[PDB]
Amino acid sequence: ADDESVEAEIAHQIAESFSKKYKFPSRSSGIFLWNFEQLKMNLDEIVREVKEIPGVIKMAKDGMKLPLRCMLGGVASTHSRRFQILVNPEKLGKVMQEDLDKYLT
């Protein structure tokens, strides 16, 4: 029950912000906007992917608000060549790590 309990909590939070534009560091400079919707991946695939991200399962377990921008950044940088070309991968690694450190303290 708990595993479906955790997945439902993840899926709920992503569904709720599915179109919310988050900021990511541009390959040029500055930022660009991106949302889960632009992945063109179904919600179940996304939820499965973000479980692989450190801390996401634990935070979901505690009913915490999840670091959706970081999670979007992880799935997108793996699966979307569009996002891969738009993004500065070095800076994205730092932003994701900064997001996780903040949410996990």
Automatic annotation (TrEMBL):
Can you say what this protein is called? Phosphoprotein
The similarity comment for this entry is:
Belongs to the lyssavirus protein P family.
Compartments annotated for it: namely: Virion
Show the coiled coil region(s): none
General function of this protein: Non catalytic polymerase cofactor and regulatory protein that plays a role in viral transcription and replication. Stabilizes the RNA polymerase L to the N-RNA template and binds the soluble protein N, preventing it from encapsidating non-genomic RNA. Also inhibits host IFN-alpha and IFN-beta signaling by binding and retaining phosphorylated STAT1 in the cytoplasm or by inhibiting the DNA binding of STAT1 in the nucleus.
- Subunit description: Homotrimer when phosphorylated. This trimer is stabilized by binding to the L protein. Binds soluble protein N, and ribonucleocapsid.
Instruction: State the organism named in the record.
Output: Duvenhage virus
| Signal peptide span | none
